């Protein structure tokens, strides 16, 4: 019936079950982690099966070395323990955890987490090849390991580690049209000018949702536009111990219209900022590692408050930029900021925690 995701440690003596690999943030609440950890032998019974969640900033290396990767910066950490179960749980086990404990024996112990909404959304960036940068991101990691205490020497062989994605969602607020007008006067125009207008239909868009951009142009100068341009280039900034202002144009389209002097022209253009169109590192920001296709473009970061975002992960912001290739003398352009976000009995089926891909 319903799907359940599980991952087993290489030492299969311990395993973890989850209800969903990706967690949605509603800008005021995050759905909790509703897992359960199973150990068949209790692992000699003198150990406590801690399950730790960490949200840490990254920079430099994924190779586990020290150069730059020393910036592993745990922005949040919790240490729920399962066996012994501690006095009373934080809210009763959900029905999913109950059915998991039914399908499994008595050797399965639940664990519950809650993530404050101030934490960054799970996003990672890969510089272009080789654009002088380093890999970085904000990953959420579950480490269910059995030990006698919290500070015991955790090791991979007997500890299962799996990664969660904290995507963000906000309501489709009927905000005002994000207008963007400009008027260009020329040195030789004798008071004439090129007019230009633009406006999105909506202010917020979900992944894969096409963007519609209004265009209005009226020409008063003696210069004709040869062709126009539309792009949704991504603005990504590494605000923690770096200044890398990545500027990759994730999606662009070309369409050749012409407007002579004393001519007016208005239209609407459709664009679709999509990751799978160009699955290249390209020095752009992702919501998850680009090795698997269950990821999309990084969701635009809401500043919120709480000491802004300088130490709280990397920011990404989108805006549609359109420009006119006038015959000879200008490249007048426009910018239209917006925000992009993630769109949002029978027995159980054990899906694997392997993030499928094409390679």
């Amino acid at each position, epitope marked *: 019936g319903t799907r359940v995701f599980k991952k087993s440690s290489p030492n299969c003596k311990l395993t973890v079950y989850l209800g969903k690999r990706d967690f949605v943030d509603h800008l005021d609440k995050v759905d909790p982690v509703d897992g359960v950890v199973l150990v068949d032998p209790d692992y000699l019974k003198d150990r406590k099966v801690f399950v730790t969640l960490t949200c840490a900033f990254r920079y430099g290396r994924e190779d586990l070395d020290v150069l730059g990767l020393s910036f592993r910066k745990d922005l949040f950490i919790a240490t729920y323990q399962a066996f*012994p*179960p501690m006095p*009373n*749980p*934080p*809210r*009763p*086990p*959900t*029905r999913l955890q*109950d059915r998991l*404990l*039914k*399908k499994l024996g*008595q050797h*399965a*112990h*639940p664990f519950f987490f809650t993530i404050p909404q101030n934490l960054p959304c799970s996003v990672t960036l890969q510089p272009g090849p080789e654009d002088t940068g380093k890999a970085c991101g904000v990953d959420f990691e579950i480490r269910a390991f059995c030990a006698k205490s919290i500070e015991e020497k955790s090791h991979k062989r007997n500890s299962v580690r799996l990664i969660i994605r904290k995507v963000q969602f906000a309501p489709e607020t009927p905000g005002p049209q994000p207008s963007a007008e400009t008027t260009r006067h020329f040195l030789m125009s004798d008071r004439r000018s090129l007019h230009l207008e633009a406006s999105l239909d909506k202010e917020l868009y979900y992944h894969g949702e096409p963007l519609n951009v209004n265009v209005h142009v009226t020409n008063n100068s003696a210069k004709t536009v040869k062709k126009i341009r539309v792009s949704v280039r991504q603005y990504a900034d590494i605000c923690l111990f770096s200044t890398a202002q990545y500027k990759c144009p994730v999606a662009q389209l070309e369409q050749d219209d012409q407007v002579s002097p004393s001519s007016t022209f208005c239209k609407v253009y459709t664009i679709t900022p999509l990751l799978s169109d160009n699955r290249e590192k390209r020095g752009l920001a992702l919501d998850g590692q680009l090795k698997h296709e269950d990821t999309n473009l990084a969701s635009s970061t809401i500043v919120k408050e709480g000491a802004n975002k300088e130490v709280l992960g990397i920011l990404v912001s989108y805006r549609v930029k359109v420009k006119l290739v006038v015959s000879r003398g200008g490249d007048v352009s426009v910018e239209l900021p917006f925000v992009l976000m993630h769109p949002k009995d029978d027995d159980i089926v054990f899906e694997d925690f392997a993030r499928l891909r094409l390679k």
Partner: antibody
Amino acid sequence: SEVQLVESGGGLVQPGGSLRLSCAASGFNFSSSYIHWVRQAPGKGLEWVASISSYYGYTSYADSVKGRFTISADTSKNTAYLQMNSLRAEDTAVYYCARQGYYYNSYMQGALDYWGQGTLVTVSS
Amino acid sequence: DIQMTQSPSSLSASVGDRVTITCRASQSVSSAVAWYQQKPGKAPKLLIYSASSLYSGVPSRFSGSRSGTDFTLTISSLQPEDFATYYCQQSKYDGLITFGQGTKVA
């Protein structure tokens, strides 16, 4: 400290009347545990009635009491009420308040660890 | 709801004997049962949970066992404490509970 589950409020009412059973709890947080009301007719086996969880607000009722009983949890007073309406002769049972256990050495699933003293609810003329 | 059956509903053994009580399930129950011992005119105390796990305040003499869809309770040695009525309970779901008719162990 010990969880002294205790209930009170039951009395005598002719059929079709109303009454509010109260279940005072202590020694544990109300949110983390389910509450079940289990009744017992005179000289008969127990019978489930209804259940509520304060944190989830998930109510459920037995078939015979599907639209006659109402169970509500008031976390402020650390108590869960069962407001009964349209009582009839068969509801002359004694009613208990029970709390599911979460862990002793495993995940006892619906074990009703702690029971109250029981309140008698007579329904007669 | 789930129909849960106990049999037989009346027994009699002497102090120091060994006793068996069987409770049957009309639907697949994933070992999610528990037995209650009710002294006359008292709140039913818990006996065992998960169909095999013991509970505090109960001597190790009680030991249930799941043998498929059926369920069963064993008492290695009957004592005066065991004069009561025993109730099998099914708890497959979260909010749904059902009890058996109970057995009067004279």
